[PDB]
Write a protein that binds this DNA or RNA. Structure first.
Ligand code: NA
Ligand code: NA
Ligand code: NA
Ligand code: NA
Length: 327
DNA sequence: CCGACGGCGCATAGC
DNA sequence: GCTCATGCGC
DNA sequence: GTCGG
């Protein structure tokens, strides 16, 4: 369905979602508004009344009344008032810096720090992550076209293999499902040396090599199993520079790699349906393992997995390649 | 009525 | 010094 | 905010 249809409602609900998360610190209302916004976005009819939309799952009495108001008037009073509230819109805005969440933004705005300029002039008050988020504010809200992601994939797969040909790496996310574009790069990594029951330098070596060929430009956080950082494609000689991009690299035991690959490929809606159907067959699937459930509902030991298909076989589903995992 | 709504790795008050 | 709750992103 | 036990 086009934005034509209910984009007004859907933008309204997303605005309300953002203020619940970033100002009111009400994550569950945030998700409630996002849940209503998406089911409505899927609705292939231009909504004509609050009551019509209240038939959808996740839209209830209050969003129903809000849609009535929008439809009669073209505005929402609460949204307009908050849209011109200096404190509220400043708090909401600063959370667009990766590393500033609702609490940091609240304390910044409480001290006069309201804008990127104010941040730029108060950097002794920012931690390392926030500093990087500030430095790359524009680049991080940009999207990543698929051809740049392939180019990025090429570098990551080539450099990982250079460090140790026994590593396995997969780029997951909507990219793996075929997406025309992406918001970041999510790399899952494993080695035969690393199992649930088994060195602390397997991730560091890949990160390091990727810094030496000057692909990874910055580190937001790094530990034994998860890396969060920044990368950038090499500029094409006398051409404009590429935008810096957000990259995550996670190191997973080999016996849980394919459950991890499954999960981080998604879709999110696909994952719910597969885990829903999996329980109807007596298994419980999480990020890590697939396990059988006894009659009294207690989980047994996780079964061997060596392919994505293994998990499909377990629950008696036909293999669906990532292209067909939209839901 | 009233609780659940995802849960975890890593960076950053209190003893 | 250390442990760990809170913040954050995902 | 919405849902459901
Ligand atoms: Na409903
Ligand atoms: Na944010
Ligand atoms: Na943020
Ligand atoms: Na080798």
């Amino acid at each position: 369905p086009q934005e034509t249809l209910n984009g007004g409602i859907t933008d309204m609900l997303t605005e309300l979602a953002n203020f619940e998360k970033n100002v009111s610190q009400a994550i569950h209302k945030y998700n409630a508004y996002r849940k209503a916004a998406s089911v409505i976005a899927k609705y292939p009819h231009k909504i004509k009344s609050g009551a019509e939309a209240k038939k959808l799952p996740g839209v209830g009495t209050k969003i129903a009344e809000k849609i009535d108001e929008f439809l009669a008037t073209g505005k929402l009073r609460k949204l307009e008032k908050i849209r011109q509230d200096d404190t509220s819109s400043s708090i909401n805005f600063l959370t667009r810096v990766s590393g500033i969440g609702p609490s940091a933004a609240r304390k910044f705005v409480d001290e006069g720090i309201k804008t990127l300029e104010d941040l730029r002039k108060n950097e002794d008050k920012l931690n390392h992550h926030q500093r990087i988020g500030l430095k790359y504010f524009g680049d991080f809200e940009k999207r990543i076209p698929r051809e740049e992601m392939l180019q990025m994939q090429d570098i990551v797969l080539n450099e990982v293999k250079k460090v140790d040909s026994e590593y396995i790496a997969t780029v997951c996310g909507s990219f793996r499902r075929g997406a025309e574009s992406s918001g970041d790069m999510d790399v899952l990594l494993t080695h035969p040396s690393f199992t649930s029951e088994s060195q602390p330098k397997l991730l560091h070596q890949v990160v390091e090599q990727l810094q030496k060929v000057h692909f990874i430009t910055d580190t937001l956080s790094k530990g034994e199993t998860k890396f969060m950082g920044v990368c950038q494609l090499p500029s094409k000689n006398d051409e404009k520079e590429y935008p810096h991009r957000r990259i995550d690299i996670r190191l997973i035991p080999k016996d849980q790699y394919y459950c991890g690959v499954l999960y981080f490929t998604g879709s999110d809606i696909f994952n719910k349906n597969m885990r829903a159907h999996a329980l109807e067959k007596g298994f419980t699937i999480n990020e890590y393992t697939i396990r059988p459930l006894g009659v009294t509902g207690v989980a047994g030991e996780p079964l061997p997995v060596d392919s994505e298909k293994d998990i499909f076989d377990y629950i008696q589903w036909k293999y669906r390649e990532p292209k067909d995992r939209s839901e």
